Design a protein around this ligand. Structure first.
Ligand code: U5P
Ligand code: MN
Length: 287
């Protein structure tokens, strides 16, 4: 209840970037938020935050440790956090020491053969875990790609009912340049006249209830396509964009929360909370 937008958010500290959507959702940028106030509001409510992350195959040795180590140090510091680690081989998962208010659990999952099914099956698995236990364990849940690293505080300013990430490479582009799925045969189809922003699927979150819907809609979309023998160009990410077009996020995070340093470092990127590392093929303005 008790929390109003004017309590912690001030769009005027960032006039040159889009800080409010047409449906009145804040876009969080460095300088526009009062963490100090929200830390108190949330800690008084004894809020607990969940974080899912998958690492299968070579990704375990390449990124899991760095992701977890940076998460321990920077994710929702000062609040209970639970890391849910999904790997195909538990005997190869790094065991790092966690700090105050962090804890975790590991789950063994079946490794898919195609990398596009690995990234897309996460949608079903997250869904299953939410109804089985995450729903009862945390207040807010985030779902992240393992190949990225926290660089600075990623705090409670990021919490919300359904949270989206502004893909780094396309935040200034307009809808007709976004790489949405354009084949009407795909469930992720988004017409050339429509679209608000291009969201990055490396980070999305919200209440467990919301995340359940996101993941459930996305996964039935991914199945439908398989059934019709088509595969959305950017897989789960395309489905996430179709979902977020129909069900707008209540909060969106600026590119400072998921920055690709391959783009360089523009005036607009004030303080990076998280950056990409290396990857699969996420939508870059590449070949
Ligand atoms: O071989 C793979 C492919 C994907 N993933 C998971 O799926 C996410 C999708 O990102 P990407 O491979 O599209 O870059 C990864 O960050 C990771 O958590 C793996 O664990 N192993
Ligand atoms: Mn990735």
């Amino acid at each position: 209840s008790k929390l109003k937008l004017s309590d912690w958010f001030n769009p005027f500290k960032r006039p040159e970037v889009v800080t409010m959507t047409k449906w009145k959702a804040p876009v969080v940028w460095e300088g526009t938020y009062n963490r100090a106030v929200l830390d108190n509001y949330y800690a008084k409510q004894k809020i607990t935050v969940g974080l899912t992350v998958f690492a299968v195959g070579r990704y375990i040795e390449h990124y899991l440790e760095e992701f977890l180590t940076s998460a321990n140090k920077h994710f929702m510091v000062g609040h209970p956090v639970i890391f849910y680690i999904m790997v195909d081989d538990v005997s190869r998962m790094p065991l790092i020491e966690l700090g105050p208010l962090r804890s975790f659990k590991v789950f063994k999952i079946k490794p898919e053969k195609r990398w596009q099914d690995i990234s897309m099956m996460r949608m079903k698995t997250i869904g299953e875990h939410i109804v089985a236990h995450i729903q009862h364990e945390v207040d807010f849940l985030f779902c992240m790609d393992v190949d990225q690293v926290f660089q600075d505080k990623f705090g409670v300013e990021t919490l919300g009912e359904s949270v989206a990430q502004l893909q780094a490479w396309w935040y200034k582009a307009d809808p007709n340049d976004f790489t949405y799925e354009r084949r009407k045969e795909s469930a992720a189809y988004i017409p050339f006249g429509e679209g608000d922003f291009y969201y990055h699927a490396a980070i999305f979150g919200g209440t467990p209830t919301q995340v359940l819907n996101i993941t459930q809609e996305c996964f039935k979309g991914i199945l439908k396509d398989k059934k019709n023998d088509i595969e959305a160009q950017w897989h789960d990410e395309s489905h996430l964009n179709k979902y977020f077009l129909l069900n707008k996020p209540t909060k969106i995070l600026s590119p400072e929360y998921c920055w690709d340093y391959h783009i360089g470092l523009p005036a607009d990127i004030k303080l990076v909370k998280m950056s990409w590392q290396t990857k699969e093929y996420n939508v870059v303005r590449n070949n």
